[PDB]
From a paper:
When DNA damage occurs, [name] can sense and attach to DNA chain breaks in milliseconds, which in turn activates its ADP-ribosyl transferase activity for modification of itself or other factors, including histones. A previously uncharacterized protein, [name], was demonstrated to be a cofactor of [name]. The hetero-dimer binding interface was confirmed through extensive mutagenesis, combined with ITC and ADP-ribosylation assays. It has been well established that [name] binding to [name] restricts hyper-automodification of PARP123,26. Remarkably, our functional analysis of the structure shows that [name] and [name] form a composite active site, with [name] contributing key active-site residues.
On the designated hetero-dimer interface, Phe268, Phe280, Asp283, Cys285, and Lys307 of [name] were found to directly interact with [name] residues (top-right and bottom-right insets), and these residues are conserved in [name] orthologs from different species. When binding to [name], this negatively charged region of [name] merges with the active site of [name] and changes its surface potential, creating an overall negatively charged joint active site that could potentially enable access to the positively charged histones. The benzamide molecule in our structure clearly overlaps with the benzamide moiety of BAD (an NAD+ analog mimicking the ADP-ribosyl donor in the reaction). The [name]/[name]-CAT ΔHD complex structure also suggests that [name] not only restricts hyper-automodification of [name], but may switch the modification from poly-ADP-ribosylation to mono-ADP-ribosylation. Compared to the [name]/[name]-CAT ΔHD complex structure reported here, we noted that the ADP (i.e. the acceptor for the next ADP-ribose in poly-ADP-ribosylation) binding site is partly occupied by [name] residues Asp283 and Glu284, implying that [name] binding is likely to abolish poly(ADP-ribose) chain elongation and branching. However, in the human [name]/[name]-CAT ΔHD (reported here) and [name]/PARP2-CAT ΔHD (reported by Suskiewicz et al.) complex structures, [name] Arg239 was found to only interact with Glu284 and Asp286, but not with any residue from [name]/2.
Residue numbers in the entry:
A (entry chain A): 30 to 345
B (entry chain B): 663 to 677, 788 to 880, 889 to 1014
Amino acid sequence: EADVSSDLRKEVENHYKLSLPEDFYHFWKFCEELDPEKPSDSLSASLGLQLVGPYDILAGKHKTKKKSTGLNFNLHWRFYYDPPEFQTIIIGDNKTQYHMGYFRDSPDEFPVYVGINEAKKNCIIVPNGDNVFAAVKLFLTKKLREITDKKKINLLKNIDEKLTEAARELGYSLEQRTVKMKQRDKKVVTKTFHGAGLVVPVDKNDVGYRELPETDADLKRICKTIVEAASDEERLKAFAPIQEMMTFVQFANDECDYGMGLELGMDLFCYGSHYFHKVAGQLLPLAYNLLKRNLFAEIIEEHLANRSQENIDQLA
Amino acid sequence: SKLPKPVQDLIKMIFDPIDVNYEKLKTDIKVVDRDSEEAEIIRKYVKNTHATTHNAYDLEVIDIFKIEREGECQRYKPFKQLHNRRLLWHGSRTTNFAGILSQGLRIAYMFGKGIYFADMVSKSANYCHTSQGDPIGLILLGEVALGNMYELKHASHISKLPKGKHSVKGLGKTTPDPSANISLDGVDVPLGTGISSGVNDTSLLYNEYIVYDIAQVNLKYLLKLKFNFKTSLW
Ligand SMILES: NC(=O)c1ccccc1
């Protein structure tokens, strides 16, 4: 529907090995209307936002860089707490590492919504509309509730008018939670530490998921002790509840409740300590492969082997 | 203590002097000769039935013991008449084996209050709860008189078996190749490598076997296993 060629779509989607929803392409064409020379930067002066990630490929920024020479889009603008489900498309304030990304429960599916995270604050992912028009509209509306500078306010209200009309013509909801998101949230089996929810198939016999034997609050206490341990011996002791839960994940896998191991590995990734990288590097690849979500197994293994806090632009 | 050294080390691991603790087990324990046929069979069973999704460790056989619990053969005798008798794995935490050997396997895990067995060594090995710094476990081989199996593809809490049935089999997607089954002292040993079971809509990766009468079990071997973990813990 958007006026982007088949060839340019395949360039974006074959590099990421993910399809992009149509609002991705429509929004690019909107930003070109905003600034034909540099559409990626059309929101920078007004909102402090820049389009990146798959938008870098639409922009032609990847030209003269190849896979052979070290180009890995699985890590491109992948911030420290971005799980495989989360694909960055927009960056904001560098002080908080604010950014937005498409959230996919499965590589075989279109994104459920646009989530945001401030990677210098925490691992929390917040839903922010189901398409990028909504996500930027909601951000803009919030900025308008925070400022009184009349010049900036008039700039934002113009962009708001343009964005709102474009989304209405295309049929994109500007609500923070849409029907699509509400239906997906009824299939969430656990929030996980990042709060954005985990979705795995659960059949008529309730096969597919089972809970962890610790509350989230108590698992965080366990992780804290592992981090604060003062020697190898102390740390092995503090790891005992984790090893126990990893054993129970094995039983759950044998009975096709693959979501339990996905949840444990995700929470350990979300906690952030490098002390969890080897255990999450066992739990998550196996869970994703058992769930036929192979691309996410590939992402998590590459990201844990190179989990950078500040040099994540593959095109710099 | 005139007990062989491997037996003495087993006693130390499970728990007075050694020969007095040995008596508490009410079990005859002998070392299987590394060059015997029993040892060949048992090591092949271990080698062939490590599942592909249990990839955190490899298993190394340290010692194999032949065990006979006091009174158990007599207790099992009426069930020896039943068809479908199979040699199966059962793992448990090391701290349970004192009671397991003295009292036998007991009844209080998703098919109710029963005694559980697997035909994949690594499935049972996981119930040892061994750890990176605690890498030695114990696993049993038991003769199980399964008879008429109640075959299931997902969890059911069984108060009682359906009339005519003697045990429950959870159907795995993967099964030891039945063409490789062998017979050992009147027991079927399913020691072939795993192939597809052809079971179409089951929610278990590997078989489970459950019996609901403690007399349906005759423990035959006890193995001491080294868990060689493939990566460090952190
Ligand atoms: N204790 C065991 O080895 C076991 C086997 C199968 C199922 C559950 C437990």
